[PDB]
Amino acid sequence: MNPITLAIIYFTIFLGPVITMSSTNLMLMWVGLEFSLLAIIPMLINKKNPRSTEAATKYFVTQATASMIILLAIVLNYKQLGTWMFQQQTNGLILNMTLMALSMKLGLAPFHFWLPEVTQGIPLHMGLILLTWQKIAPLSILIQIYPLLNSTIILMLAITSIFMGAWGGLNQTQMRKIMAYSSIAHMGWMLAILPYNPSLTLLNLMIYIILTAPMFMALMLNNSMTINSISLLWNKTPAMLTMISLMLLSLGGLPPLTGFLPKWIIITELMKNNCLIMATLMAMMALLNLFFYTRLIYSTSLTMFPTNNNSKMMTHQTKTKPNLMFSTLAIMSTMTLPLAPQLIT
Amino acid sequence: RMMRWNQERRRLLIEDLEARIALMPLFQAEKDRRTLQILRENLEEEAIIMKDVPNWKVGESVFHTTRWVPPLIGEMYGLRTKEEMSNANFGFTWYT
Amino acid sequence: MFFINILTLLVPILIAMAFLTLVERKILGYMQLRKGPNIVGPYGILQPFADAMKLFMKEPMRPLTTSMSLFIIAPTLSLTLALSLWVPLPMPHPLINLNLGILFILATSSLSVYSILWSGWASNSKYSLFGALRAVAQTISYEVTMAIILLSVLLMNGSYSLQTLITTQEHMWLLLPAWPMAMMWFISTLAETNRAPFDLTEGESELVSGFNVEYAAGPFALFFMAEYTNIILMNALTTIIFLGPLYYINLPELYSTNFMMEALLLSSTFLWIRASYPRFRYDQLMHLLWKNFLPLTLALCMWHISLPIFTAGVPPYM
Amino acid sequence: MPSTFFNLTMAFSLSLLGTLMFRSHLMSTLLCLEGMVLSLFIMTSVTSLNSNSMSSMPIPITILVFAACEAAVGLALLVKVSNTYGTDYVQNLNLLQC
Amino acid sequence: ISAFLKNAWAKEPVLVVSFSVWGLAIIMPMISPYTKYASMINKATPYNYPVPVRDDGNMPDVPSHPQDPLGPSLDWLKNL
Amino acid sequence: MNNYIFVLSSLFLVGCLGLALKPSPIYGGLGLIVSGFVGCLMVLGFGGSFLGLMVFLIYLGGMLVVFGYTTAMATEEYPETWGSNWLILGFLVLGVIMEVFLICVLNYYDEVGVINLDGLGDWLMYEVDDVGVMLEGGIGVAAMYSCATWMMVVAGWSLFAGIFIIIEITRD
Amino acid sequence: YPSKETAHWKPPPWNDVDILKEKAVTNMTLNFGPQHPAAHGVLRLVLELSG
Amino acid sequence: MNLYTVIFINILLSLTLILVAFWLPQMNLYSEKANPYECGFDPTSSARLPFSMKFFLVAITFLLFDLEIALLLPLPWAIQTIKTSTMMIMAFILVTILSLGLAYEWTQKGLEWTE
Amino acid sequence: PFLDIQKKLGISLDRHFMFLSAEQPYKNAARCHAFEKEWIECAHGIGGTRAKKECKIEFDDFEECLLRYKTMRRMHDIKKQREKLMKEGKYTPPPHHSGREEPRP
Amino acid sequence: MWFEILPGLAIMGVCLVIPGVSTAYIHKFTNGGKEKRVARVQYQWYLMERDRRISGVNRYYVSKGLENID
Amino acid sequence: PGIVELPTLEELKVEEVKVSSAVLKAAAHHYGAQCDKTNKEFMLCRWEEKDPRRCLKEGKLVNGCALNFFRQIKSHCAEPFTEYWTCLDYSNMQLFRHCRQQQAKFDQCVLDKL
Ligand SMILES: CS(=O)(=O)C1CCN(c2cccc(Cn3cc(-c4nc(-c5ccc(OC(F)(F)F)cc5)no4)ccc3=O)c2)CC1
Incomplete structure (x- = not known):
């Protein structure tokens, strides 16, 4: 890949969601989504292996179907009430099919069966992008029309995402699928509160992003893709075990870490609207989410799996990674709960 | 040569359009008067019909405003025959 | 009356296709130091009727490997479109006045390729498939430059209508300002018809007949007459766009006469070219249209976008 | 108008049904996607002409642009799939089960 | 560089012409004194009716009649 | 007349159905060409010609490319048609019958805002400017150059990026 | 966790590269003759083609 | 209505020709006649197998170029606009970006066929 | 809206052609222009919660201009009654309704 | 010699001239000794429908002059 | 809900022109300078009241002024105007x-006698 191609493609990836955010017309939101999903593919298939090709196919087909559905919704809201952007006087069928398609894109349950695979088949720096930067524009759409979304549908989707993320990442050995299911669960959280308060789903998104990005960075440090591989960190990069453990316990939602703040301030805002049952179930299954992060902490830091006769070489050699941003984000993702009032509003 | 010829063509277009301008008032008067005639005929006949059906107001509008809403082809040419109707729809798309 | 006009536009076109086959044979003969048909009738004016009658008297073929539906539809469509492209033509008055006549032409022509495609696919023979894929390549090659050439010309006409070109050329041909575009359009029409040097869809020296190899008398005659009709059609297009017959509203007959003279000249030129040159390789056609005609075509499109502006010569909308 | 729009919506729904209910071949699904694009383009153009809103005609042409770009990348992915497995079948890309 | 342009004009003159025409198309509008007239003409065309205004009695610059010598004249287009 | 646009929409529906039944992409591209022709016809019947001719040309080129591709990647020894599989033919006929049923039962039980067999042809061209000179559809699509400049750069960049992207994808 | 469904499951490769069954070439064979005009009359010239 | 008339007349002419071509002549059908033609000998395989395409990239590119043509076609109307500078600039940008994409493809050897 | 960049820089990339009441080519007018204008002007400065109750009359007039369900119902009922009459012989369309009219002008 | 070709060329020339002259003469014969009115924009069609109506018989080419204003 | 009022068939009855289109196109440039006042009053009243x-x-x-115009024509210069609009009705547009030699006779006739 030459720098001209890289420039065009990455600029397009960046531009896609910007148009969606900065646009009043729905059609241009759609073309932004399309820029995103057209530019992201070559970065997936760059490695040129069967897994990459099939990941690309499963991503393209799904996103194209969802985009066509969103376009149908826009066109019906144009035929009706003769404007482009939605309004209070718009069919709930339109709104709900739009929400369903946006979920399909985001990868929420039961529209999630494609995200773990697509993330397992590609490299890690793209999984990072896929799970962090590509989940915004859909959420922008949802945040511009939150008064109109049905609460029944988003709540069913959210509890389903929570349950399925937990149960799925529970028995995964590959790390990329664990991160995929973490994304599914945290997106379920993001969505469970969107109609009541969308200033909290953005918070949960920011926190999940600053939490998963340095995890992916750690994995990319030694190109670690399994539990048994990260088990070897005590011999390769033992200076990373502390941050790894803290970020995992935060992702799980343990105090006094700022991964507990989204959970807590979402349960609160939900019970301010009398959603006792939803928040209860969500928390009880976030516990299960935490379980496999804890098993992973065991495997990596709190005990020492066997190593190999060759890692002595890796010990001999030097390393230029990670950069400054890993430490920054990993500190601002575990040790910032004391500033919660500043984070929440 | 093409410059000069296209300029003279633009001038001739100005001329044709100025003629159209001079004539549009007459056409507008005729069109308005004719639409009103058609609507009054359809009103008289809607009154003959619907004379005994319960709870029917002949000229009742489907609008809560009282300003003039220009009618549409279905209304103007609804009671009339089907050829006089298809002309209004496909008459100009199905050229002279 | 309209049906009589349909007849006066259709039957002469078919007679002209027949006598165009005749003129083709005789011109190529005299170029090849031979005569051409002179036996069947006086100087051979019955050879086309002989050929057609003989073909429609032969046993057609319903092979075992073919998709008969498409195998039969394709020639129907070929001939239909070859005859339908002649309706919006002003000579100087058309039978069907279309505002977007140019686009009708473009679409119908781009559609006539599916006759070849479906014929070659249905036949279910390798040479047929090869002819079909070669047609695919040929279209992919020429269709890009066709529309841009045509747009660049029309940006001084003011519309896609074929009857405003007559007033545009009322004083001077469109060849002088657009002879580069005229040359490229000539070669691209040469390709659109699968005509030499671009007779690749039926290249007898590589593919026995291409998409025709399994086709027999009647359907083959349909294909052949569609080809020799589209020839005259594209010549008429060249000589309505770039060459301008004399239009004096009291004298449309002179317009038809000069139109016919120029069309004959351009068709005889097609035959001349078939006789004078070897045949391309279907990759070289792509390379030509995509490396010498498309760059220049874009440059000239920009030139003719600007010219009406820094000349104040923007055309009128009716 | 209303019957036209109902039929075009039913057509979009049929093409979506096809896209969702795969068969062996992938290009058929790509074609169903293109059919959905066609339905939507037609619906939008009809709406803009019924409303006489000539400021919204630039929309369907963009629809077509982006639909064709999607089709292009789909055809490229299809090329890669065929190179890998020799065929465009969907039952062959099932190795990401782990 | 002249030798490069020369061997290109000999070998690949089609791209030379293409770039030259590109540049001339981009330049000549900046050069001509008849460029301003395009928009003036496309504005002079009355594709719509010239809706008249109410004579409030404070429109001295506005005419009471087409042939009243007031308003935009098209002489610059009648002799161009 | 009056049944014209409805017949067009029904033919479009049947084309899209036979497409969704996924026969060999050859016949699917055929159905797509036919559906684009019908869409052109109906768009012309609603007033606009430019958009119809446009979509027609576009889908013709697309189906040309698709033929070229399916003859290379999506072919089979015995390609399937609508008649080949009894099940596919049966569901096709069933879909036609179900369309008929839906129409004839909605006309009865439903209101007239969706399907009104009696009253057909009355609502195609609601309003029009009888004295008009500048109503062609190409005026709107040309607004891209003057007013809607954003859509133009957006689409052009989409195509640029598409070139680069397909190259990068097809690299071996 | 194992199941009756996940018994045949194999751990994926360490580089995401999968040893794949080598799909042999399918080269279109064609009888270029005889009766072909190019072929001067008695040549068959069976050849293989990739396109 | 007249366009419909003419086109249907042409349909009927073609179909009449085909009918009288399929029902007028004397036939004698047998397998060795109805069998495919492969230059005197028997086919070694079916013609319904993958026929590799070496210009697939050029066809993909042709799609996008067709779309750019679709975007260029409204110029005859865009030149009737008051905002002439904007139309000029946008058309120039469009054609230039098109040419730049073509040049990148050319240089990276996309217009050349896989061998 | 999510990032009101336009409203910051003071530009308009996508918002000057959203609804039908916007500037159209050559100062034409989309149908239901006035209804849309009045709806928008009523819904200005009060929010979408109030507008759903206070601009209801205007929005309904707009919805009827655009979709025209009620004109359809009315003309359908008229035609139905007329067909009933003609069936049972209680009506005869006047001349101007049967082609034979005085074609003014 | 080469002049043995002029028969076919002349035949095809006659056959290519016939269509235009026929269309023109038929348009004149059917539209009252006038060129078939062109309706490129709705204004021309409006004019033609006006003419059709004012003409006693519904035909746009029966031109009614000053003989019909008193 | 409310009724829609419509004039009566007699309230909207005039002395119609019943004159063709080529004739109006011939006489328009003079009908614009001689009836601008009433034409523009009507049309302003139209855009202002939207009813x-x-x-x-x-x-x-407007109809009355047009009739008076065409009577001033029919009295003085019927025949040149006839030639003009007869020549002008022949074209397809x-x-x-195509009728400049007759336009000049008509315009000179009117310039002289009116
Ligand atoms: C060595 S060379 O350079 O000399 C080489 C140059 C090429 N060449 C040549 C050129 C043109 C035609 C032919 C004879 N030929 C005729 C037909 C064919 N013709 C008609 C047909 C239908 C209707 C017609 O009108 C009407 F009947 F009235 F309807 C008229 C004709 N159907 O199929 C098909 C195949 C074919 O080879 C031969 C000679 C030899």
Whole structure:
């Protein structure tokens, strides 16, 4: 890949969601989504292996179907009430099919069966992008029309995402699928509160992003893709075990870490609207989410799996990674709960 | 040569359009008067019909405003025959 | 009356296709130091009727490997479109006045390729498939430059209508300002018809007949007459766009006469070219249209976008 | 108008049904996607002409642009799939089960 | 560089012409004194009716009649 | 007349159905060409010609490319048609019958805002400017150059990026 | 966790590269003759083609 | 209505020709006649197998170029606009970006066929 | 809206052609222009919660201009009654309704 | 010699001239000794429908002059 | 809900022109300078009131002024105007550039006698 191609493609990836955010017309939101999903593919298939090709196919087909559905919704809201952007006087069928398609894109349950695979088949720096930067524009759409979304549908989707993320990442050995299911669960959280308060789903998104990005960075440090591989960190990069453990316990939602703040301030805002049952179930299954992060902490830091006769070489050699941003984000993702009032509003 | 010829063509277009301008008032008067005639005929006949059906107001509008809403082809040419109707729809798309 | 006009536009076109086959044979003969048909009738004016009658008297073929539906539809469509492209033509008055006549032409022509495609696919023979894929390549090659050439010309006409070109050329041909575009359009029409040097869809020296190899008398005659009709059609297009017959509203007959003279000249030129040159390789056609005609075509499109502006010569909308 | 729009919506729904209910071949699904694009383009153009809103005609042409770009990348992915497995079948890309 | 342009004009003159025409198309509008007239003409065309205004009695610059010598004249287009 | 646009929409529906039944992409591209022709016809019947001719040309080129591709990647020894599989033919006929049923039962039980067999042809061209000179559809699509400049750069960049992207994808 | 469904499951490769069954070439064979005009009359010239 | 008339007349002419071509002549059908033609000998395989395409990239590119043509076609109307500078600039940008994409493809050897 | 960049820089990339009441080519007018204008002007400065109750009359007039369900119902009922009459012989369309009219002008 | 070709060329020339002259003469014969009115924009069609109506018989080419204003 | 009022068939009755289109196109450039006042009063009254029912007597006055114009024609210069519009009705678009020798006779006739 030459720098001209890289420039065009990455600029397009960046531009896609910007148009969606900065646009009043729905059609241009759609073309932004399309820029995103057209530019992201070559970065997936760059490695040129069967897994990459099939990941690309499963991503393209799904996103194209969802985009066509969103376009149908826009066109019906144009035929009706003769404007482009939605309004209070718009069919709930339109709104709900739009929400369903946006979920399909985001990868929420039961529209999630494609995200773990697509993330397992590609490299890690793209999984990072896929799970962090590509989940915004859909959420922008949802945040511009939150008064109109049905609460029944988003709540069913959210509890389903929570349950399925937990149960799925529970028995995964590959790390990329664990991160995929973490994304599914945290997106379920993001969505469970969107109609009541969308200033909290953005918070949960920011926190999940600053939490998963340095995890992916750690994995990319030694190109670690399994539990048994990260088990070897005590011999390769033992200076990373502390941050790894803290970020995992935060992702799980343990105090006094700022991964507990989204959970807590979402349960609160939900019970301010009398959603006792939803928040209860969500928390009880976030516990299960935490379980496999804890098993992973065991495997990596709190005990020492066997190593190999060759890692002595890796010990001999030097390393230029990670950069400054890993430490920054990993500190601002575990040790910032004391500033919660500043984070929440 | 093409410059000069296209300029003279633009001038001739100005001329044709100025003629159209001079004539549009007459056409507008005729069109308005004719639409009103058609609507009054359809009103008289809607009154003959619907004379005994319960709870029917002949000229009742489907609008809560009282300003003039220009009618549409279905209304103007609804009671009339089907050829006089298809002309209004496909008459100009199905050229002279 | 309209049906009589349909007849006066259709039957002469078919007679002209027949006598165009005749003129083709005789011109190529005299170029090849031979005569051409002179036996069947006086100087051979019955050879086309002989050929057609003989073909429609032969046993057609319903092979075992073919998709008969498409195998039969394709020639129907070929001939239909070859005859339908002649309706919006002003000579100087058309039978069907279309505002977007140019686009009708473009679409119908781009559609006539599916006759070849479906014929070659249905036949279910390798040479047929090869002819079909070669047609695919040929279209992919020429269709890009066709529309841009045509747009660049029309940006001084003011519309896609074929009857405003007559007033545009009322004083001077469109060849002088657009002879580069005229040359490229000539070669691209040469390709659109699968005509030499671009007779690749039926290249007898590589593919026995291409998409025709399994086709027999009647359907083959349909294909052949569609080809020799589209020839005259594209010549008429060249000589309505770039060459301008004399239009004096009291004298449309002179317009038809000069139109016919120029069309004959351009068709005889097609035959001349078939006789004078070897045949391309279907990759070289792509390379030509995509490396010498498309760059220049874009440059000239920009030139003719600007010219009406820094000349104040923007055309009128009716 | 209303019957036209109902039929075009039913057509979009049929093409979506096809896209969702795969068969062996992938290009058929790509074609169903293109059919959905066609339905939507037609619906939008009809709406803009019924409303006489000539400021919204630039929309369907963009629809077509982006639909064709999607089709292009789909055809490229299809090329890669065929190179890998020799065929465009969907039952062959099932190795990401782990 | 002249030798490069020369061997290109000999070998690949089609791209030379293409770039030259590109540049001339981009330049000549900046050069001509008849460029301003395009928009003036496309504005002079009355594709719509010239809706008249109410004579409030404070429109001295506005005419009471087409042939009243007031308003935009098209002489610059009648002799161009 | 009056049944014209409805017949067009029904033919479009049947084309899209036979497409969704996924026969060999050859016949699917055929159905797509036919559906684009019908869409052109109906768009012309609603007033606009430019958009119809446009979509027609576009889908013709697309189906040309698709033929070229399916003859290379999506072919089979015995390609399937609508008649080949009894099940596919049966569901096709069933879909036609179900369309008929839906129409004839909605006309009865439903209101007239969706399907009104009696009253057909009355609502195609609601309003029009009888004295008009500048109503062609190409005026709107040309607004891209003057007013809607954003859509133009957006689409052009989409195509640029598409070139680069397909190259990068097809690299071996 | 194992199941009756996940018994045949194999751990994926360490580089995401999968040893794949080598799909042999399918080269279109064609009888270029005889009766072909190019072929001067008695040549068959069976050849293989990739396109 | 007249366009419909003419086109249907042409349909009927073609179909009449085909009918009288399929029902007028004397036939004698047998397998060795109805069998495919492969230059005197028997086919070694079916013609319904993958026929590799070496210009697939050029066809993909042709799609996008067709779309750019679709975007260029409204110029005859865009030149009737008051905002002439904007139309000029946008058309120039469009054609230039098109040419730049073509040049990148050319240089990276996309217009050349896989061998 | 999510990032009101336009409203910051003071530009308009996508918002000057959203609804039908916007500037159209050559100062034409989309149908239901006035209804849309009045709806928008009523819904200005009060929010979408109030507008759903206070601009209801205007929005309904707009919805009827655009979709025209009620004109359809009315003309359908008229035609139905007329067909009933003609069936049972209680009506005869006047001349101007049967082609034979005085074609003014 | 080469002049043995002029028969076919002349035949095809006659056959290519016939269509235009026929269309023109038929348009004149059917539209009252006038060129078939062109309706490129709705204004021309409006004019033609006006003419059709004012003409006693519904035909746009029966031109009614000053003989019909008193 | 509310009724829609419509004039009566007699309230909207005039002395119609019943004159063709080529003739109007021939006489338009002179009918613009000689009836601008009434034409523009009617049309302003039209755009200002947006109701074809409030602005009707103005339309009757428009018809009357047009009839008076065409009578001033039919009295003095019937025959040149006849030649002009007969020449101008022949074209498929009723173009002026095909009848310039008759346009000049008509315009000179009117310049002289009116
Ligand atoms: C060594 S060379 O350079 O000399 C080489 C140059 C090429 N060449 C040549 C050129 C043109 C035609 C032919 C004879 N030929 C005729 C037909 C064919 N013709 C008609 C047909 C239908 C209707 C017609 O009108 C009407 F009947 F009235 F309807 C008229 C004709 N159907 O199929 C098909 C195949 C074919 O080879 C031969 C000679 C030899």
